[PDB]
Amino acid sequence: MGRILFLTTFMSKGNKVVRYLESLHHEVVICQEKVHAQSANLQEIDWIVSYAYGYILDKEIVSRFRGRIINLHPSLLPWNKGRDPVFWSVWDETPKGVTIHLIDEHVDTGDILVQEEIAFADEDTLLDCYNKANQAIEELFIREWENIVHGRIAPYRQTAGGTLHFKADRDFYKNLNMTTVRELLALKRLCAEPKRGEKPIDKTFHQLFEQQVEMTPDHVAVVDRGQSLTYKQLNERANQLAHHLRGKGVKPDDQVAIMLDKSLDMIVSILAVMKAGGAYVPIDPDYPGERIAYMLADSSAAILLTNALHEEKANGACDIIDVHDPDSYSENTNNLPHVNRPDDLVYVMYTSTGLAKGVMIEHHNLVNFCEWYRPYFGVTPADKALVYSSFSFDGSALDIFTHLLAGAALHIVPSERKYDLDALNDYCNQEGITISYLPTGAAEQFMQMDNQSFRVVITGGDVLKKIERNGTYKLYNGYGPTECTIMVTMFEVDKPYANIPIGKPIDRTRILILDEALALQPIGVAGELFIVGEGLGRGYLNRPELTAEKFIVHPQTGERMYRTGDRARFLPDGNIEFLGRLD
């Protein structure tokens, strides 16, 4: 009857389409390469039928064969134009279907000849969907071919809108071929970009603290043994010191070293550094003089807040401000004029494998964690919390900062009860301590101690393994590197597990389980744990190349992500599971 040119790159040469056309006594020329006008494949051709053809016909050809180029596209056009239509139909959750349409000078925008809806089951693999779609459109072609040949079908223009996808758009999703529709949409819900409407964080910590002071000014802020400071008292004293600090020339992004033991002065010093404008660099006096010297050297801290006791441990490294000298405190008790942005540094903490690296954290990083922490754990002014961790560690940021914005009362943990957890347990039972964070080691011990005061306890760092505890308090296992601010995931331990999961991401953060090629892994499949979102800090101080290494720009996505180097995977219920180091 007529000679037909069948164009395709993916489909076979024995399609139901080809054989059906051949059954009608058509000479079907099959071609799987890009052709030009001179091509012998275009000699005496009546109809061109394209089907998953991965090339564009020259406009010379499309005009010459106008109204005679038919294309089988397994999507409900205008939805999912271009490449991988079925995959993107499932992923973007668009209407499903198959479309036989005309070819124009653009990608899958030509007028429709025939079109019908298709349906994918929640249990179908994407390969099944791909096959079902091809099956459907092939049958449709065989059904409507006679109507198309005689040209009795009225072509109707596509609806406005739809979507388009290019060849490379599926690179990030190359491992999801055998995943189910359900599994795929689940992975989407877990790892897809944040929904619209969100705005950038617009507050610093000392802004929110100063706000909290005006709401609960006479409430106890911090307690050390028999002495205590209210929010108003703490604020005023921190202000007095902060005025003196800013007077010494402290400015945004400037580092200010603090070398003190756990005390009221430490809290005053920290808040004073913030309110002054700079970021505080905590230095444990019990560190070796070597690390202390290095920490002071690496950091650009021109100022050091410390005692006369620990004064000499710095060896005249910097201008010292004595927290016990009344001259170090100004008369002015008012809140200083704000000069900070949320992207200014708030603190620099060090993590020792090599020489210790100064992790840079910004205000918005800390604000996000605190703003998540308060409602998540339902913290109120009624609560009381321990300042347990060394203030050189990020666990102290949890202790001090999260509870101060909740209006709660901090309780300093002295040295005499740092190791004796039975004595600390007595303190907690006496003072009615309700919530706190203990490292995994210490937390596992506190389960042995008989406690009645606690309402919640939070653990993180090393691998949790024990769960059984005497008290009647909720147990929470968290996870996250210092580079991504304290913690990025949190789990409520309800049952015992051989591997206690580290939970789901906190506010404004996403965790992505990627393979070596930085492509998505299906739910339940192991891979490297990548962190994304508000938690990511500025990077390592004075280590730009190492920062570039660990804080990456994803090849496909282009988002800023932190490479943890940890091994993990998502459980079916969304909870993340830690699976040791990569090496």
Dihedral of CA 475/481/486/488: which sign?
A: negative
DSSP 91-126: HTTPPPEEEEEE--SSSS-SPEEEEEE----TT-BH
Are the C-beta atoms of 57 and 45 separated by less than 8 Å?
no
Please state, in angstroms and rounded to a whole number, the distance separating the CA atoms of residues 537 and 485. 7
Which among 98, 181, 95, 112 has a CA at the least distance from the CA of 148?
112
Please state, in angstroms and rounded to a whole number, the distance separating the CA atoms of residues 512 and 520. 7
Which among 228, 301, 296 has a CA at the least distance from the CA of 267?
228
* Three-state SS annotation for 238-270: HHHHHHHHHHCCCCCCCEEEEECCCCHHHHHHH
Structure tokens at 522: 């299906």
Output 446-450 pairs: Cβ under 8 A, ≥24 positions apart. Answer: 446/421, 447/471, 449/421, 449/422, 449/424, 449/425, 450/425
Structure tokens at 572: 């079916």
Structure tokens at 471: 């008290």
Buried b (16+ CB within 10 A) or exposed e, 275-309: bbbbbbbbbbbebeeebbeebbebbbbbbbbbbee
Which among 265, 207, 278, 173 has a CA at the least distance from the CA of 522?
173
Peptide bond preceding 522 in cis form (omega within 30 of 0): no
Biggest CA-to-CA distance, the chain: 105
Q: Quick one: DSSP state of residue 400?
A: I
Distance of CA 356 to the CA centre of its chain: 25
CA distance readout (Å), 121 to 192, 399, 409, 567: 22, 49, 54, 32
Look-up: residue for tokens 């570039």? 548
Please state, in angstroms and rounded to a whole number, the distance separating the CA atoms of residues 216 and 221. 9
Instruction: Tell me the β-bridge partners of 96.
Output: none
Please state, in angstroms and rounded to a whole number, the distance separating the CA atoms of residues 370 and 487. 11
Structure tokens at 186: 């689940």
Integer Rg of the chain from CA: 32
Please state, in angstroms and rounded to a whole number, the distance separating the CA atoms of residues 241 and 235. 10
Please state, in angstroms and rounded to a whole number, the distance separating the CA atoms of residues 117 and 135. 13
Are the C-beta atoms of 24 and 49 separated by less than 8 Å?
no
Please state, in angstroms and rounded to a whole number, the distance separating the CA atoms of residues 477 and 578. 11
CA distance readout (Å), 567 to 515, 539, 573: 10, 21, 18
Dihedral of CA 416/417/420/422: which sign?
A: positive
| Strand-pair category, 474-479 with 357-362 | unpaired
Dihedral of CA 536/537/541/544: which sign?
A: positive
| Strand-pair category, 303-306 with 319-322 | parallel
User: CB-based burial of residue 447 (10 Å sphere; 0-12 exposed, 13-18 middle, 19+ buried)?
Assistant: middle
Starting at the edge strand found earlier in the chain, the sheet holding 409-412 runs 227-230, 220-224, 409-412, 384-387, 435-439, 456-460, 474-479, 489-493, 504-505
| Strand-pair category, 220-224 with 409-412 | parallel
Any residues with CB less than 8 A from the CB of 243 and at least 6 apart, and which? 276, 330, 332, 336
Please state, in angstroms and rounded to a whole number, the distance separating the CA atoms of residues 574 and 504. 7
CATH class of 2-191: alpha beta
Please state, in angstroms and rounded to a whole number, the distance separating the CA atoms of residues 269 and 278. 12
Please state, in angstroms and rounded to a whole number, the distance separating the CA atoms of residues 445 and 431. 20
- Encoded amino acid at 208, one letter: L
DSSP 123-176: T-BHHHHHHHHHHHHHHHHHHHHHHHHTT-S--BPPPS---EE-GGGGGGGTT-
Are the C-beta atoms of 478 and 464 separated by less than 8 Å?
no
Local structure of 281: helix, strand or coil: strand
- Encoded amino acid at 447, one letter: M
CA dihedral 369, 275, 257, 253 (to 10 degrees): 80
Q: Quick one: DSSP state of residue 486?
A: S
Local structure of 524: helix, strand or coil: coil
Q: Please give the helix or strand (H or E) that residue 17 lies within, else none.
A: helix 16-23
